[PDB]
Design a protein around this ligand. Structure first.
Ligand SMILES: *C(=O)[C@H]([C@@H](C)O)[C@H]1C[C@@H](SCC/N=C\N)C(C(=O)O)=N1
Length: 268
């Protein structure tokens, strides 16, 4: 049931000037679309969605965790912290930091939560605990986005991203209340309107998390999509390019998502 219908991914990545990796799953029939799906690509900020899921998992054993108030100093505010900078003088709860990390890609919020979990190795350990043997987070923020060609640090594959996303949003990796909270945070994302969402009709529900490293044409998005009248679709779209100053493209990500839905026979 893999690639029952071929799609012109190769022409798309050649026009872009780099590499595109796609893995999309129809959770009803099990049919898939797969292109460079087992290659490694930089996660960039997309790790923050899995970070929030790891916080929710811990909250199953710590009933007070989500409402715990976290204060922080000005030294915590790194570039692109649009929510946490408004609460510097007050603090924010763990749940609020998680929402900001998912929905605004807030960097200070993600760093505080990574600390709570035991750093890059702690997030990696959570991913191992749901059966993902590909994901690796290795560095703390900023340098984790270097996107160096051939460097496996801070990478995963489109396939492992999609499989883990399915387990957390639709499967049994989280308890039911935590599962729906993760879905609700993804549905509220504000940074993805020109990526997978641009390929999804307005009357379908959708949640996603983006990544944009800023170098090497490297950017990405993953999403769960609920077309009406059929089972949900889970997909991941990752890009990279050979030269440090190659630009990323949101349009290429949206176009790749459209080809994935077409390959699955989902009318959009
Ligand atoms: C994560 O990928 C980004 C980290 C490295 O800052 C973060 C920033 C935004 S896009 C770039 C912001 N504007 C000028 N540089 C982002 C996202 O929306 O995915 N995540």
């Amino acid at each position: 049931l893999t690639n029952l219908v071929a799609e012109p991914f190769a022409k798309l990545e050649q026009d872009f000037g780099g590499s595109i990796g796609v893995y999309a799953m129809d959770t009803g029939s099990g049919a898939t679309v797969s292109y460079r799906a087992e290659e490694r690509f930089p996660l960039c900020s997309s790790f923050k969605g899995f970070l929030a899921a790891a916080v929710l998992a811990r909250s199953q054993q710590q009933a007070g965790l989500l409402d715990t108030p976290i204060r922080y100093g000005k030294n915590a505010l790194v570039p692109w912290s649009p929510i946490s900078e408004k609460y510097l003088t007050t603090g924010m709860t763990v749940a609020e930091l998680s929402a900001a990390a998912v929905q605004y890609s807030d960097n200070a919020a993600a760093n505080l939560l990574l600390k709570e979990l035991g750093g890059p190795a702690g997030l990696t350990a959570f991913m191992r605990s749901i059966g993902d043997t590909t994901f690796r987070l290795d560095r703390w923020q900023l340098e984790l986005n270097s996107a160096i060609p051939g460097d496996a640090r801070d990478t995963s594959s489109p396939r492992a991203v999609t499989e883990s996303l399915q387990k957390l949003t639709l499967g049994s990796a989280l308890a039911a209340p935590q599962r729906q909270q993760f879905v609700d945070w993804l549905k509220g994302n504000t940074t993805g309107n020109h990526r997978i969402r641009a390929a999804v009709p307005a009357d379908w529900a959708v949640g996603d998390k983006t990544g944009t490293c800023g170098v090497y044409g490297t950017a990405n998005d993953y999403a769960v999509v609920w077309p009406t009248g059929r089972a949900p679709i889970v997909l991941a779209v990752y890009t990279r390019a050979p030269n440090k100053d190659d630009k990323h493209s949101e349009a290429v990500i949206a176009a790749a998502a459209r080809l994935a839905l077409e390959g699955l026979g989902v009318n959009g």
